[PDB]
Coordinates of N, CA and C in Angstrom, one line a residue:
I9 N 93.3 112.8 109.9 CA 94.4 112.6 109.4 C 95.8 112.4 110.0
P10 N 96.8 111.6 109.6 CA 97.0 111.1 110.3 C 98.7 112.0 110.3
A11 N 99.5 111.3 111.4 CA 100.7 111.7 111.9 C 102.1 111.0 110.4
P12 N 102.9 111.9 110.0 CA 103.7 111.8 109.0 C 103.9 110.1 109.2
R13 N 103.5 109.0 108.4 CA 104.1 108.1 108.9 C 105.8 107.5 108.9
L14 N 106.7 106.7 109.6 CA 108.2 106.5 109.0 C 107.9 105.4 108.8
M15 N 108.9 105.3 107.5 CA 109.5 103.8 106.7 C 110.7 103.7 106.7
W16 N 110.8 102.9 107.3 CA 112.7 102.4 107.1 C 113.0 101.5 106.0
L17 N 114.2 102.1 105.0 CA 113.9 102.3 103.6 C 115.7 101.5 103.9
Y18 N 115.3 99.9 102.7 CA 116.3 99.3 102.4 C 116.7 99.5 100.8
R19 N 118.2 99.5 100.9 CA 119.1 100.1 99.6 C 119.2 98.1 99.2
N20 N 118.4 98.2 97.9 CA 118.7 96.6 97.3 C 119.9 96.1 96.9
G21 N 120.3 94.9 97.9 CA 121.8 94.5 97.3 C 122.3 94.7 97.8
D22 N 122.2 95.6 99.1 CA 123.3 96.6 99.4 C 122.7 96.1 101.3
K23 N 124.2 94.8 101.4 CA 123.2 93.9 102.6 C 124.2 94.7 104.6
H24 N 125.2 95.6 103.4 CA 125.1 96.4 104.5 C 124.8 97.5 105.4
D25 N 123.7 97.7 104.4 CA 122.2 99.0 104.7 C 121.4 98.6 105.8
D26 N 121.8 99.7 107.1 CA 121.3 99.4 108.3 C 119.9 99.8 108.1
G27 N 119.4 100.5 107.4 CA 118.2 101.2 107.1 C 118.2 102.7 107.3
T28 N 117.3 103.2 106.5 CA 117.2 105.1 106.6 C 115.8 105.1 106.9
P29 N 115.6 106.0 108.2 CA 114.7 106.3 108.1 C 113.6 107.7 107.2
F30 N 112.7 107.7 107.0 CA 111.9 108.6 106.1 C 110.8 108.4 106.2
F31 N 110.3 109.6 106.9 CA 108.7 110.3 107.3 C 107.9 110.7 105.8
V32 N 106.5 110.3 105.8 CA 106.2 110.5 104.5 C 105.3 111.7 105.2
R33 N 105.6 112.7 104.6 CA 104.4 114.0 104.8 C 103.2 114.0 103.8
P34 N 102.0 114.3 104.6 CA 100.7 114.4 104.2 C 100.9 114.5 102.9
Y35 N 101.3 115.6 102.2 CA 101.1 116.0 100.3 C 100.9 115.1 99.6
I36 N 102.3 113.9 99.6 CA 102.3 113.0 98.9 C 101.5 112.2 98.4
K37 N 100.6 112.5 97.2 CA 99.8 112.0 96.6 C 99.8 110.8 95.4
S38 N 101.2 110.7 94.6 CA 101.3 109.9 94.0 C 102.4 108.6 94.6
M39 N 102.3 107.7 94.0 CA 104.1 107.2 94.6 C 104.4 107.2 94.0
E40 N 105.0 108.0 92.6 CA 105.9 108.5 91.6 C 106.3 109.7 92.6
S41 N 106.0 110.3 93.4 CA 106.1 111.8 94.1 C 106.7 110.9 95.0
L42 N 106.0 109.8 95.6 CA 107.3 109.1 96.7 C 108.9 108.4 96.4
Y43 N 108.3 108.0 95.0 CA 109.8 107.7 94.9 C 110.5 108.7 94.5
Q44 N 110.1 109.5 93.8 CA 110.8 110.8 94.0 C 112.0 111.2 95.5
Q45 N 111.1 111.4 97.0 CA 111.6 111.9 97.2 C 112.4 111.0 98.1
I46 N 112.1 109.5 97.9 CA 112.6 108.5 98.2 C 114.2 108.8 97.9
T47 N 114.2 108.6 96.6 CA 115.3 108.2 95.3 C 116.1 109.3 95.9
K48 N 115.8 110.5 96.7 CA 116.7 111.9 96.7 C 117.2 111.7 98.2
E49 N 117.0 110.9 98.7 CA 117.3 110.7 100.4 C 118.2 109.5 100.4
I50 N 118.0 107.8 99.6 CA 119.6 107.1 99.7 C 119.8 106.8 98.4
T51 N 119.4 107.6 97.7 CA 120.5 107.3 95.9 C 120.8 106.1 95.3
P52 N 119.7 105.3 95.3 CA 119.9 103.4 95.2 C 121.3 103.8 93.7
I53 N 122.5 102.9 93.8 CA 123.2 103.4 93.0 C 123.1 102.2 91.6
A54 N 121.4 101.8 91.6 CA 121.0 101.6 90.1 C 120.1 102.4 89.8
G55 N 120.4 103.7 89.8 CA 119.0 104.4 89.3 C 117.6 104.1 90.3
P56 N 117.0 105.6 90.0 CA 116.1 106.3 90.8 C 115.3 105.0 91.5
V57 N 114.3 105.3 92.1 CA 113.4 104.2 93.2 C 112.5 104.2 91.5
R58 N 112.0 102.7 91.6 CA 110.4 102.7 91.3 C 109.7 101.1 91.6
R59 N 110.0 100.6 92.5 CA 109.4 99.9 92.9 C 109.8 99.3 94.5
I60 N 109.0 99.3 95.5 CA 108.9 99.4 96.8 C 108.3 98.1 97.5
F61 N 109.3 96.9 98.4 CA 108.0 96.4 98.1 C 108.0 95.9 100.2
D62 N 107.5 95.7 100.6 CA 107.4 94.9 102.1 C 108.2 94.1 102.5
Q63 N 108.2 93.8 103.8 CA 109.4 92.4 104.3 C 108.6 91.2 103.3
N64 N 106.8 91.1 103.2 CA 106.1 89.7 102.4 C 106.5 90.5 101.0
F65 N 107.4 90.9 100.5 CA 107.7 91.3 99.6 C 106.5 91.1 98.5
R66 N 105.1 91.7 99.1 CA 103.9 92.8 98.3 C 105.1 94.0 97.6
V67 N 104.8 94.3 96.5 CA 104.4 95.6 96.0 C 103.8 96.6 96.2
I68 N 104.5 98.5 96.7 CA 103.1 98.9 97.2 C 102.6 99.7 96.2
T69 N 101.6 99.6 95.7 CA 100.9 100.1 95.1 C 100.0 101.4 95.1
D70 N 99.5 101.9 96.6 CA 99.2 102.7 96.7 C 99.6 103.7 97.9
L71 N 100.4 104.7 98.1 CA 100.4 105.3 99.6 C 99.4 104.8 100.4
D72 N 98.1 104.9 100.5 CA 97.6 104.3 102.4 C 98.1 103.0 102.7
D73 N 99.1 102.4 101.6 CA 99.4 101.2 102.1 C 100.4 100.6 102.7
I74 N 101.1 102.4 103.1 CA 102.2 102.3 103.6 C 101.8 102.3 105.8
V75 N 103.0 101.2 105.9 CA 102.7 101.1 108.4 C 103.4 101.5 108.4
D76 N 103.4 102.5 108.8 CA 104.3 103.3 110.0 C 105.5 102.4 110.6
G77 N 106.3 102.9 111.1 CA 107.2 102.0 111.5 C 107.6 100.6 110.5
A78 N 106.9 100.2 109.6 CA 107.4 99.1 108.9 C 108.5 99.3 108.0
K79 N 109.4 98.3 107.6 CA 110.3 98.6 106.6 C 110.3 98.2 105.0
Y80 N 110.7 98.9 104.5 CA 110.7 98.6 102.6 C 112.0 98.9 101.5
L81 N 112.0 97.4 101.3 CA 113.1 97.5 100.1 C 113.0 97.8 99.3
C82 N 113.7 98.6 98.5 CA 113.6 100.6 97.5 C 114.3 99.6 96.2
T83 N 113.5 99.5 95.3 CA 114.9 99.0 94.2 C 114.1 99.8 93.0
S84 N 115.1 99.8 91.5 CA 114.9 100.7 90.4 C 114.3 100.2 89.5
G85 N 113.4 99.2 89.8 CA 112.9 98.6 88.7 C 113.5 97.1 88.8
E86 N 114.5 96.4 89.0 CA 115.2 95.2 88.8 C 114.6 94.4 90.2
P87 N 114.3 92.9 90.4 CA 113.7 92.4 91.4 C 114.2 92.3 92.6
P88 N 113.7 91.6 93.7 CA 114.8 91.8 95.4 C 115.9 91.0 94.9
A89 N 117.2 91.4 95.4 CA 118.8 91.1 95.3 C 117.8 89.7 96.3
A90 N 119.4 88.5 96.3 CA 119.5 87.4 96.4 C 118.4 87.4 98.0
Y91 N 118.6 86.7 98.9 CA 117.9 86.2 99.8 C 118.8 86.1 100.8
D92 N 120.7 85.6 100.5 CA 121.7 86.3 101.7 C 122.1 87.9 101.6
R93 N 121.5 88.3 100.9 CA 121.7 90.1 100.8 C 120.6 91.1 101.8
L94 N 119.6 89.8 101.9 CA 118.4 90.7 102.5 C 118.5 90.2 103.8
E95 N 119.1 90.0 104.6 CA 119.2 89.6 106.2 C 118.6 90.7 107.5
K96 N 119.2 91.5 106.8 CA 119.2 93.5 107.8 C 117.8 93.6 107.8
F97 N 117.0 93.7 105.9 CA 115.9 94.4 105.5 C 115.0 93.3 106.0
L98 N 114.6 92.0 106.3 CA 113.9 91.0 106.7 C 114.1 90.8 108.2
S99 N 114.7 90.9 109.4 CA 114.7 91.5 110.6 C 114.4 91.7 111.3
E100 N 113.4 91.1 112.2 CA 112.2 91.7 112.6 C 113.2 93.1 114.2

C-alpha cells in the first residue's frame, strides 16, 4: 500500500496557473470519485473535471496510472487548450 501520490494539477486554458498540489488519498477507487475531489480543489470555470491528461496528453483511465509528483491537465470534457496556453503545464 503506497503513500498518497502527489498530483500537480493544471487548470485547462489558464495560462497563469502555476499548478495546484493535490494528494490522492488511498481510499479513492473510481475516476469519478477522483474528479469530484479535484473539482472541489481547483473549481474549473468550465464545470466539474471530467478528463485528466498527463504531459504526453494521454487520458488517465485508471487510478493506478497516476505517478507521484507528475503534472496533470484537468478539463471539464473539452480538449486541451491551445499550445501557447500550456507552457507551465508542459515545463519540466
